[PDB]
Amino acid sequence: MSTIALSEIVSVVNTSDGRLEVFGVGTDKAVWHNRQMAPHTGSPWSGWSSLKGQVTSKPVVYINTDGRLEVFARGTDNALWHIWQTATNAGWSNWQSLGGVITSNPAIYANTDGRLEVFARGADNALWHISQTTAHSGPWSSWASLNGVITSNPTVHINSDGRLEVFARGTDNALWHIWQTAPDSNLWSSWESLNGIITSDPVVIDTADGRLEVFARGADNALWHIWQTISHSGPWSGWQSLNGVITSAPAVAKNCDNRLEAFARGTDNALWHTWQTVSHSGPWSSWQSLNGVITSAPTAVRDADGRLEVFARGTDNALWLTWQTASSWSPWISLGGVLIDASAIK
């Protein structure tokens, strides 16, 4: 090789054969990827390989229900583009355009029927969407709008009853959301406010007990969170603070035993984290340091050994990596590369 907290720089997944794969953007705007050779913590890596393209968003990878990776990104023409594996253990298609004009990073989820659906802000600052017409395959539907006015990158998750739900910051800086009223459908609720004042993109995750929980940096630069109180249903909890003082977007992942763990850059530019103790219903720890000097938000994922691995850009613009050990965490190692923050919203 109008603002939000500093973004995550890579998109990462644990793939169908248990290997982590990371996607980023280089200075000449191509998408690059790196993957583990073996399905274990501390595996050697491929090194960075270019998938070409010319992107103007964060590239976002998603796993189709047949196991094939597909990467979505905004192009220089502001259309949504994508590229996909022709088989789970094979090569890639060419980059192809799905048209439209978009103004955020794309957000992707599979419906219960296997059709990917993609969400992205439009030129009008509404949330637009487009979907595969058949499971894990093109061709795609026409674009349409779910309205609203949003000021952050959107994030989508699936409820435990199969209904997609999308979250995004509004013009009043509150967290807003909208949901499918039935799985696989084009029937959506109205937008509703969950209030709060947020200063990062929201992060959403499903708990062990089937509730959506959303994390975001607050107006005080603490990490805050809010959750569904009943599985796949409102009412939501109040916003609750997890404290800390964070200088990037947060990242969240589940441990082996479903205990949630949040990561973010701190005031000293080190990686910090806080986790649930005891169980997935337990109280959160104090914030503790994992060291490093990072120039992006962290990106967290659980590997095939059930350990968390965290990636973040370094002062040299390489991607660095630390992971959980029995005792502690490993020292930061470099995966090299030269990565940029290509986020469509900053």
Ligand X SMILES: CO[C@@H]1O[C@@H](C)[C@@H](O)[C@@H](O)[C@@H]1O
Report if residue 197 touches ligand X, rule: CB under 6 A. Answer: no
Output the six-digit token pair for 113: 């029927």
Residues 6+ apart with CB under 8 A from 64: 70, 84, 110, 114, 116, 136
Binds 148, which of Na ion, Cl ion, ligand X, none (CB < 5 to 8 A, cut-off by type)? Answer: ligand X
Among 149, 222, 245, 338, binds ligand X (CB under 6 A): 149
Cα 281 from chain centroid (whole Å)? 23
Classify residue 140 as exposed, middle or buried by CB count within 10 Å of its CB (0-12, 13-18, 19+): buried
329 is in an annotated binding site: yes
Distances (CA, A) of 19 to 12, 337, 339: 10, 19, 21
Any residues with CB less than 8 A from the CB of 343 and at least 6 apart, and which? 7, 57, 58, 105, 153
**Cα dist. 118→214, 244, 344 in Å?**
19, 33, 15
The verdict on 208 binding a copy of itself (CB under 8 A) reads yes
With CB under 6 A as the rule, give the number of residues binding ligand X: 17
Whether the upstream peptide bond of residue 235 has omega within 30° of 0, thus cis, is: yes
Is residue 213 part of an annotated ligand binding site? no
- Mask of contacts with a copy of itself, 20-39, x by CB under 8 A? -------------------x
**C-beta of 148: minimal distance to ligand X in Å?**
4
DSSP string for 4-16: -SPPB--EEEE-T
The token pair at 219 is: 């107006």
304 near a copy of itself (CB under 8 A): yes
Residue 154 interacts with ligand X (CB under 6 A)? Answer: no
Quickly list DSSP for 262-281: EEEEBTTSSEEEEEB-SSTT
User: Whose CA is closest to 218, among 194, 198, 195?
Assistant: 198
Q: Which of residues 36-55 bind ligand X (CB under 6 A)?
A: none
The reply to whether 338 sits near ligand X by the rule CB under 6 A is no
Min CB(11)–Na ion separation in Å:
8
Asked whether residue 272 is marked as a ligand-binding residue, the answer is no
User: What number of chain residues touch Na ion (CB under 5 A)?
Assistant: 6
Site for a copy of itself in 124-153 (CB under 8 A): 134-136
**Binding positions for Na ion, rule: CB under 5 A:** 14-15, 17, 19, 155-156
Q: Residue positions in the annotated binding site for beta-D-galactose?
A: 68, 70, 132, 138, 140, 163, 165, 228, 234, 236, 259, 261, 324, 329
**Binding positions for a copy of itself, rule: CB under 8 A:** 16-19, 39-40, 64-68, 87-89, 111-114, 134-136, 160-162, 183-184, 207-210, 230-232, 255-258, 279-281, 304-307
**Binding positions for ligand X, rule: CB under 6 A:** 148-150, 170-172, 176, 191, 291-294, 314-316, 320, 332
Q: Residue positions in the annotated binding site for Mg(2+)?
A: 14-15
